[PDB]
């Protein structure tokens, strides 16, 4: 962050969301003036406010606002910006965009057009990687055009086969055939949806690796030929072939294999003559054998974790490389510092197909910025609207530590202290993934979610001790609300005689079971007897704050009260999962047995 | 010198004619009386005392500051008089000037009359012939209406308030009569509706005339807004004089007692 280094003076961020905010923050730290484009609906977004100048580029849809290349060109001409940063997605990997930028004197911060077009298609990428002495997934090089050809390829490469759409991306046009009839009918169908959406109609037939691990290597290269492989990242936890939990240092990889993969990635980058930051993705099998799989010629979404473990600013490095300065770090200078874990908080319902996109307006939004070792990359704010036009991603939460256990503990704390009200999110799924025994041990594959939850996500299967803790907390909260209800100001005309009650006898209905609870209050401490078990709950009992911190038998728990009704229904978010309980008084519980069910 | 006296006489003569003789003839052709004739018929002869005769509107937008747009009195005649020897305060809206639309001066005069009436404890009779609020005035007009509204609620139960609709009252000119104790209409010449038939056609898409939407028959037979309807202005004013004899001047006074045979 040296102000003496003379980089550009005006950079246009041709993107939206959290990536635009991150680029704007880096540019502001470096001292470069920032210009941000936006649509009509994003006129009040965070990134437009954080930028120095803003230019509307069209209506809500992306095809006419952020993919509207022409309007971006007039925005550049009007603002007279010197550099452009696409972030990831949209026009980040558009060769014709690169040609348009190269037509004028404004520079494109990223890889050259030749590198982008080389890795734009999967078959040519595989051919070049094979020519670049890099291990590749076994398969047939070429394009399959008929079902018989595909099934014959399945003959020589084995019954387990994968059919993939060329280029494309985004985890679509990619399925698995186990049999020859499966091979042919899947090939015909894949051609059908390739014509429907992609339009390329170019397909690849290859081998399916069983129980694979998605390991990425972050490469950084300048225009003078230097190239560093930095470190690796693990992104095994996926649904719909899309990552949701990323882990910076690989627990499955040792030093030797990591160094070999980094050297292979650097060799491939030098063969391509990459002159920016990119990622090379491999699929490591059980026997520690890695095969090349795609190379993203752009900034990676899950890049902040390698920044945390390496102490680097990738955006700054790409800006410096685009300016033309050489790399200021050597391969030996790269080192691993701690551990890092990232979770993608989405606006999806995890109970339906491991996340179904949802819409709404955020009524409450608070990030756990005060928690130790927590970094939040979000482009939203209270009052933000989750629309159908853009990616329904709420935030990226990164936690770093001295080791894996500390990082996971801080991740759990941050997930517990993160307030979203207005939409449905997948925080419960993230917490269940990070507290899973297999995840803690490290035995994770790309189908972790599929086999850990064969019937789909159901929530947290709370144990007996946790059930007692939850019941005690709910009963204490109910009694605290009842006690607060009796605090009036002095009237001096009709004094209030506070009802002196020692023990509250309650019936708490949770799931389909009913428990008898005896609660006693001694000021700030509640003694709760649930089915004989005795517990103590102490807290400040602030009933207005969205987060409530309590201490049950010494164990500290952070809970949220999402809803509360006079009829006794309360929704409580505890351990990341929302439980609906119904608390009645003992007399009310007895009299409720005469009520007819509707 | 003589200039001030001649200007005073000219302004008096102009105020007597309202907004011109041509519009007076147009009003007469419609079968309606002017505000001053209505006041003369309602009150005892030689007992009317007029106030705020020279008051003019203070609007300057949309070329309303021109001399041709200045009318002394500003579409309302306000004052006090006596019916059968008993005091009463009266205002009559002049449809001749800007269609009787309520400007700032209109509301100021009406509010002054209502304030004096509540100060002395005498009833208020209002002859309504207003086309609504003056659009050129803007929010001021709205404020004026609200002022009147407030005083109505302040005078409810203190002094009797009587409203006689003698013309096409529309828009916000329909809520002051609703806040008064009694409301009378004139057949075939008086109307009461918040929105006209054109807006109803634009939004609701139905064919109704002014008479069907807000006529005297509609408001006296099925709407329940008006209390009685009379044949014409003369009959209505005679019956209003007859009805005024029943009421006391204020809630501080007992029920009137007259000579019996």
């Amino acid at each position: 962050y040296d102000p003496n280094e003379k980089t550009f003076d005006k950079i246009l961020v041709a993107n939206r969301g959290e990536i635009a905010c991150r680029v704007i923050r880096t540019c502001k730290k470096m001292g470069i003036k920032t210009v941000a484009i936006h649509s009509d609906v994003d006129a009040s977004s965070v990134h437009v406010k954080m930028a120095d100048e803003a230019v509307c580029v069209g209506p809500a849809p992306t095809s006419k606002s952020y993919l509207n290349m022409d309007a971006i060109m007039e925005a550049i001409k009007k603002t007279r910006a010197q550099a452009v940063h696409p972030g990831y997605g949209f026009l980040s990997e558009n060769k014709e965009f690169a040609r348009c930028l190269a037509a004028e004197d404004v520079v494109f911060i990223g890889p050259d057009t030749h590198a982008i077009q080389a890795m734009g298609d999967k078959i040519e990428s595989k051919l070049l990687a094979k020519k670049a002495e890099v291990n590749t997934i076994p398969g047939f090089d070429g394009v399959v055009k008929d079902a018989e050809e595909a099934v014959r390829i399945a003959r020589e490469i084995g019954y387990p086969v994968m059919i993939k759409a060329s280029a494309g991306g985004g985890g679509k046009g990619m399925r698995i055939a186990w049999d020859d009839e499966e091979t042919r009918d899947g090939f015909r169908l894949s051609s059908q949806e390739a014509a429907s959406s992609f339009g390329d109609d170019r397909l690849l037939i290859e081998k399916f690796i069983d129980n694979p691990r998605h390991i990425e290597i972050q490469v950084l290269g300048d225009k003078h030929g230097n190239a560093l492989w930095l470190n690796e990242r693990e992104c095994s936890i996926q649904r719909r072939n899309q990552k949701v939990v990323e882990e910076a240092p690989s627990i499955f990889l040792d030093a030797e294999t990591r160094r070999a993969m980094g050297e292979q990635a650097v060799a491939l980058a030098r063969a391509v003559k990459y002159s920016s930051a990119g990622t090379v993705e491999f699929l490591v099998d059980s026997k520690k054998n890695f095969y090349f799989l795609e190379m993203n010629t752009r900034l990676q979404v899950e890049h902040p974790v390698t920044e945390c473990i390496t102490g680097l600013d990738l955006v700054q490095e790409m800006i410096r490389v685009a300016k033309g300065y050489p790399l200021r770090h050597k391969q030996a200078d790269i080192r691993i510092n701690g551990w890092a874990v990232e979770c993608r908080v989405y606006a999806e319902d995890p109970y339906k197909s491991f996340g179904l996109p949802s819409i709404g307006r955020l009524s409450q939004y608070q990030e756990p910025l005060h928690l130790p070792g927590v970094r939040v990359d979000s482009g939203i704010q209270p009052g933000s609207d989750i629309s159908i036009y853009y990616d329904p991603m709420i935030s990226k939460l990164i936690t770093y530590g001295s080791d894996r256990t500390e990082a996971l503990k801080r991740m759990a704390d941050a997930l517990d202290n993160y307030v979203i009200r207005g939409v449905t999110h997948n925080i419960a799924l993230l917490r269940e993934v990070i507290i899973n025994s297999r995840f803690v041990k490290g035995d994770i594959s790309t189908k972790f979610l599929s086999d850990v939850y064969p019937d789909g996500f159901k929530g947290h299967m709370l144990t007996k001790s946790e059930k007692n803790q939850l019941l005690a907390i709910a009963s204490s909260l109910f009694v605290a609300f009842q006690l607060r209800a009796q605090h009036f100001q002095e009237n001096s005309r009709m004094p209030v005689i506070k009802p002196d009650i020692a023990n509250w006898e309650l019936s708490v209905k949770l799931h389909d079971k009913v428990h008898t609870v005896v609660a006693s209050n001694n000021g700030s401490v509640f003694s709760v007897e649930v089915d004989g078990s005795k517990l103590n709950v102490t807290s400040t009992w602030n009933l207005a704050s969205p987060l409530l911190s309590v201490s049950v038998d010494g164990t500290q728990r952070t809970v949220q009260c999402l809803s509360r009704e006079a009829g006794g229904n309360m929704s409580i978010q505890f351990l990341g999962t929302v439980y609906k309980v119904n608390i009645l008084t003992r007399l009310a519980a007895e009299l409720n047995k005469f009520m007819l069910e509707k | 010198a003589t200039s001030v006296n001649e200007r005073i006489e000219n302004k008096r003569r102009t105020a007597l004619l309202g907004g011109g003789q041509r519009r007076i003839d147009a009003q007469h052709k419609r079968g309606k009386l002017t505000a001053r004739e209505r006041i003369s018929l309602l009150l005892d002869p030689g007992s009317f005392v007029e106030s705020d005769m020279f008051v003019e509107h203070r609007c300057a937008d949309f070329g309303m500051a021109a001399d041709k747009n200045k009318f002394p009195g500003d579409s309302v005649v306000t004052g006090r008089g006596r019916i059968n020897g008993r005091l009463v305060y009266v205002f009559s809206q002049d449809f001749t000037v800007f269609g009787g639309s309520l400007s700032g001066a209109h509301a100021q005069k009406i509010c002054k009359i209502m304030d004096q009436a509540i100060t002395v404890g005498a009833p208020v009779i209002g002859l309504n012939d207003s086309g609504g609020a003056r659009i050129q005035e803007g929010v001021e007009s709205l404020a004026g209406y609200a002022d009147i509204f407030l005083r109505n609620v302040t005078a409810s139960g203190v002094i009797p308030q009587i409203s006689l609709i003698m013309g096409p009252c529309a828009g916000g000119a329909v809520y002051s009569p609703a806040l008064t104790d009694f409301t009378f209409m004139v057949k075939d010449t008086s109307y009461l509706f918040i929105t006209g038939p054109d807006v109803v056609k634009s939004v609701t898409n139905e064919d109704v005339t002014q008479e069907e939407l807000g006529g005297a028959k509609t408001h006296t037979t099925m709407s329940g807004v008006a209390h009685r309807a009379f044949e014409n202005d003369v009959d209505a004013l005679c019956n209003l004089r007859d009805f005024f004899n029943y009421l006391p001047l204020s809630s501080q006074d007992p029920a009137p007692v007259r000579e019996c045979h």
Partner: protein, 247 residues
């Protein structure tokens, strides 16, 4: 619940387009203590919202327009409901908070034949006689006599605030232009001039009809402070046995 809590989620809740409708219950929930609201008649006359809530621990009555239902227009049922709620709150020393977004009264022959005039006068009367502290916030629109009815400053209101999206006008811009420039018959630049000069809260602000144009995120705070100073409000009115409400 702190009384100075900011509500940044209200900064963009009102859409820019006048055709789009928002939910006033969201604003009410954001403003009040602990986002707790006891609504009265929630399933009847849904174009208006009345209920009880708390501000700084003090019971308050809330009346607001619902743009979701019938674009927030007033009719007979909503008028009666709001009028009776306001009358009760005034009779039992409960402060009133009003949120105003109303285009006017519902047109049609059904409303006119049902006595829309006398029922609409009920709400105006109820707001006019109220002697309890009353705080009004205009969110988007206040047109015609509906602006006067919905607790205007000229009804002895205490504090009136307008959001930067407020529009206080005698009527809509199109109707006003076509009723003023009928002789001029030139609506080319008339629309532009009228919307630039009158479609904003400035004409009401420069005449003192609204105390201030506040940022939405301060709304709750601005209300709470007011409720601190208006708790000792006392007014005197002429003596009467009772008044004659247009029942």
């Amino acid at each position: 619940d702190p009384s100075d809590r900011l509500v940044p989620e209200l900064d963009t809740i009102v859409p820019l387009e006048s055709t789009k409708a928002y939910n006033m219950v969201d604003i009410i929930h954001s403003v009040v203590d602990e986002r707790e609201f006891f609504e009265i008649m929630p399933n009847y006359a849904k174009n208006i919202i009345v209920g009880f809530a708390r501000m700084n621990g003090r019971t308050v009555g809330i009346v607001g327009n619902q743009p979701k239902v019938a674009s927030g227009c007033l009719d007979i049922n909503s008028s009666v409901k709001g009028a009776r709620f306001v009358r009760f709150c005034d009779a039992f020393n409960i402060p009133l908070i009003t949120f105003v977004d109303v285009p006017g009264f519902l047109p049609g022959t059904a409303q006119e034949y049902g006595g829309i005039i006398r029922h609409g006068a009920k709400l105006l009367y109820a707001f006019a006689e109220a002697t309890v502290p009353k705080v009004t916030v205009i969110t988007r629109k206040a047109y015609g006599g509906a602006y006067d009815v919905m607790s205007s400053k000229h009804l002895c209101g205490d504090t009136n605030y307008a959001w930067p999206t407020a529009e206080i006008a005698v009527m809509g811009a199109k109707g006003a232009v076509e009723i003023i420039f009928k002789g001029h018959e030139n609506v080319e630049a008339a629309q532009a001039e009228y919307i630039e000069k009158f479609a904003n809260p400035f004409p009401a602000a420069v005449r003192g009809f609204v105390d201030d144009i506040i940022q939405p995120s301060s709304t709750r705070a601005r209300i709470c402070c007011d409720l601190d100073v208006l708790a000792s409000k006392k007014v005197q009115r002429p003596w009467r046995k009772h008044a004659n409400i247009p029942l």
